[model samples]
Target chain A: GITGTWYNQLGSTFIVTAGADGALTGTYESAVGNAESRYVLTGRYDSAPGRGDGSGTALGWTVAWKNNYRNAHSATTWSGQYVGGAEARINTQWLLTSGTTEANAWKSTLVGHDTFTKVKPSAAS
Target chain B: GITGTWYNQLGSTFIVTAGADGALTGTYESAVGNAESRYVLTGRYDSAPGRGDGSGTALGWTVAWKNNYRNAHSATTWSGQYVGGAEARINTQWLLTSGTTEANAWKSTLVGHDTFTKVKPSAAS
Candidate 1:
């Protein structure tokens, strides 16, 4: 039920499809630095509506990036829910970590939130 | 400001310290499965206070678990905010992914929420 091309406010795109058991597989294309590269992501969805403490359909995902030597090694994780069972919008919060080395620990983590909608405004117009 | 011990309703413990730039380094001991092991985590905080679209002081973190080969390779990420500015509580949501092999993608992700408060009743008493 979470299958679709989703767009976030930051202009990044997530295109995903779910398996029979609610596993999620997808490709993400960010609007930033590596605009042309598509990154693989893995995730899961709970079909049960109350999984989110009555918020909506609970789901989560991760993207381990391949930086091509131009960037620090990094990964991102997203925890979210599909609101209202309409599959129209997803409210998510994300954490990203860059650099696996201990020395970089001091400044390698970034945090934020994003709202994703099924319909791409540019495409629909 | 995020430097302290935090506990979730699920009974997990997160002990952390922050750097001048808002970088966070910590150890997390889960309440279930491998409760004895202390996992290292890294994260960041936005002291600017409006990082969450006015939610509060935004923050996030990542923990790469050392499962001793008894468990699948997994990691957990948390994105959160400190609401009300009292440093009394933190509201967070997390995503966890297990298994790095392609086949395990079908069922390796989990998601949920937790609220951590400054005071540990048992310790205080």
Candidate 2:
């Protein structure tokens, strides 16, 4: 089942889950400033686990839905990638398309990377 | 039933068909020239049949997964918006990021527009 809490070095959180198909459809919380905001990610399962390595990969993109630092209703995207076997990792690329405020439109940058590890149920995330 | 063929004056075609869940899941074929290419678009069902306009909308982004004009692995995006009823339209904004070739990777532009009209099945396509 694609249901769990994933974390990174910066203490960022991503609540991940999927349908029976096991795709990447989930919510994200990226810590910026002293607070954080919510972002929704919709993506596909890039590759299935190969028999030997028990490894697989997925690629999905996200948009800020509410409380986004880029401002709500802004042109921005986050490319989320997941690779896993016995252990899993989720990384991201930030793309700032355009904003209502002071930032220039169409800005692309590799802002940060988040490596994910699933937290067991009733366990610290 | 989210299944049908949608076309536009630009001669661009989008063959769309969703799953039993009525979610937007389909393949995209954008014609840049006499020849065309295939891209995978993964998006969410924006709203249900709101009971008015007989319309529903969806938003999905596509990255060239195969036979792409922009080399194969390029950071490009096509934001697809679908608004429909008896008469429908599929509009898009092109965001071309950095490329492997001469084109600037961070280049973002409103390259083309495609409005889709569904082709009714058999009685007349």
Candidate 3:
């Protein structure tokens, strides 16, 4: 159900494909830094579709910025919900952690929120 | 490091116990609905602490609202980051899903964000 391209307000974008067993694999492009490089991500979704007032699917995924091509050594994980129908959107929270050796520890971890909407196919193209 | 009582702005609280193997066990008390009941939660933390500007632990957990008494049926999963130091805090994003029977589907899934601070001993005593 989450198979589509979604973009957040900050300009970051992700193209996701949902598998048969609630598996999710995607490529994420950040709005900042090395915006051109795509990072691989893997996660899972709630297979059970919810009922009245609860018909949203919950999911979570992670992206590892390994090998340093993107100039990042941190990893980020996202927890989110996909609400379908006329007002489809993906709401998410993310946590990025770099490493454990910071002098000012508070800066080691960063947290943020984002709301994403589907990139619809334009008919007037 | 995340072992203690933390409260959010909504008046909800959770007491957590972190195990050696990144295992997390906690009890969450909601601010609304069944305010008196404590729900069991199980989650995990990133075993590898981050370095300078990245000295945080990323974690996620879930709570299942089953049986009755609480007068609701739903499950909530939280994705979070724990930043340690003088300004220790747990920042999180949560998704709650009930079921698929709703006619107005968007209300089926709810999403929100929260930042939690440790409850100091002096305040409770």
Candidate 4:
């Protein structure tokens, strides 16, 4: 199980799941904050890549996430995409989330978009 | 009377003003063509806060401006602060500007501070 921090606006639901084949997924409900809302993120390491000094690298894992929001003053729906990357020091990869709202004006639509950038850890000294 | 728009560095000393009781002042100095440097502001209208539909409602009318930069890389000295507002359809009471050096490193040295915020209009309708 890959553990990570999640935040919601009001009574919204947020979830994260990892697949047996090394795929990661996430979902977020509409936010509750008035102006702009933000959350602190934390993630857990499910399976480290190699072993010993090189065991913590992210060599085969893939990640993805999404957010759906209500249209501006309308009932229509809108969504955004998120990408993930690895931070070597912590031996963990992270998924960074971005949002789509009137403020962003649809520039970040989630249509088959891949926002993750693969990052490899440095070799042990 | 008063006028808008000013630029600096492209040499220096860009100024505009209205006199005595009315007093609207501005000065832009040092800003050639380059990254981070911007220009293209125009102003023209002074000493008439109550003419037609209340004329251009910035009443008593007092405005000021300032900006200085250099440091972040050495030589040293950075500054930023600009705030003024008024927009009556087109009556125009504007002076919106803001900046600081070293990505805002000297947040403490500024000594005095005031980010102006006063939007007034819509009496004619």
Candidate 5:
């Protein structure tokens, strides 16, 4: 039993869930297309410490690419180290770059802070 | 010892290890936010074995509009890329739109495939 929710830069929200096999399956209520989005992400627990403990907990993550409706192409990768706990506040330093484009490419290193509240699991017991 | 992982749509995965700093002293998390989740991505990678070898891997990603939680102001600057492979499996397709929001928003073009293992230490040891 797996479940997840997605929030887009557009302030739109969607819900996603995983099957018993860990495969993701779900829908985008506000997406341009009514199609459901699917993909897989490998996750791990950060072994770092915390500020109180004089150390910090940074959960590092990466994502792969897949296709969508429009024909835009994205072939880049990024890494973010998030510092905080499951129900605590965390800050992330994300560095990003563009690829496959001709010119005027851009790069950015952003620092972001956010709080996480685990969503209730869908009824699929 | 500082160690971590990252993946992309291009069947690529990169092992990003930290030096003594732990300051996220690395690169590219496939993003574009020079501000703050005041401009932040909430959070969250994955795989291939096409009919043959020409394609096999996929990752999903999303962007957000922080102004709603704050103010409706984004100077608008969009240009980025991503892939996966330090040595093993990955793929990515990112659906990013334009507008700091207007119209004529396009979609995506992708089916990234890559791999990941680990990167050895730099001589700084």
Candidate 6:
């Protein structure tokens, strides 16, 4: 059921939930980029393993991107090749959109390999 | 090898090129929006179906987003579930960034389901 919270080395948190129809959904939050930048993101999910009751790393995909609280914004796409069942990791790659009045905003290309390890779940829904 | 150009009824186009390692890289351009707004996106590919010599009806993933020419910017992700070998369709989903002076420039969530069918390839590479 891939339902739980996950943590990364950068202290970013990923909260995920799966559905009975083999779909997935969740939210992800990154650590403060600076004193002035933070992020909140959400997306749906697809795919699951074929082993037991679809509980482990059975191959999953997530479509997520940046929801900025500041001027910084970007988009991301992830494929979960090694989802650790309750514990998981995200194979990520992202692109920064060109916006704001910064010196240079757009990313040259897709970039990221951030990983997430599952922790626990919410106490109350 | 999925190296060709694809088109949609809405005029959206997906130009793809498959890699030796089964990854994908490509570009997408949307139809012109009102008051001069459009998108240019690119991302790598992952995964293929477990049949044949790695072609047709395989699974693939792409990470692409809006590279603005005017002011609007967005993020996108795609999972290709029914790639028809030389012809294909993209199960597209996108998230707009919160930026500019608009009240709701950012999208509420991931939203898209465009398709693409290949016609030909670039000759003068």
Best candidate (score: lDDT): 3
> In candidate 5, which residue ranges exceed 4 Å CA deviation?
A1-35, A47-56, A68-71, A75-90, A93-96, A106-116, A119-125, B1-125
lDDT of 1 by residue, A14-104 (tens): 8888666445667777762355566656565553333211234556666655433222245567766565455467766677655322243
In terms of TM-score, how similar is model 3 to the real structure?
Answer: 0.50
Q: Comparing to the true complex, what docking class would candidate 2 get? A: incorrect
* Candidate 5 lDDT, A22-122, residue by residue in tens: 12334433342345433223322222122221222222222333334321122122222222244322222222322222233222212232222233223
Largest TM-score belongs to which candidate? 3
Candidate 4 lDDT over A31-65, as tens digits, reads 43321221222222234354453333232222232
lDDT of 1 by residue, B1-125 (tens): 57888877776888888656445667777862355666656665553433211234456666655433222245566766554455466666677654322243435457676788776556432
Per-residue lDDT over A1-125 for candidate 6, one digit per residue giving the tens place of the 0 to 100 score: 45676666676665666555333445556652242233333232323223321222322233223233432222345533333434345433333222112122222124344555665333654
lDDT of each: 0.60, 0.44, 0.64, 0.31, 0.28, 0.39
Clashing pairs in model 6, backbone N/Cα/C closer than 3 A: A24-A45, A49-A58, B24-B45
Q: Who is ahead in TM-score, 1 or 3?
A: 3
DockQ list for all candidates: 0.05, 0.08, 0.14, 0.02, 0.07, 0.04
Using lDDT as the measure, name the better of candidate 1 and candidate 3: 3
Rank ordering of all candidates by DockQ, starting from the highest = 3, 2, 5, 1, 6, 4
Ranking by lDDT: 3, 1, 2, 6, 4, 5
lDDT of 1 at B70: 25
Could you give the DockQ of candidate 5? 0.07
Per-residue C-alpha lDDT of model 3 across residues A1-125, encoded as one tens digit per residue: 58988888776788889776555667777752355567665565665554443455666666645423553545566666677887688776666655444364446557676788886333553
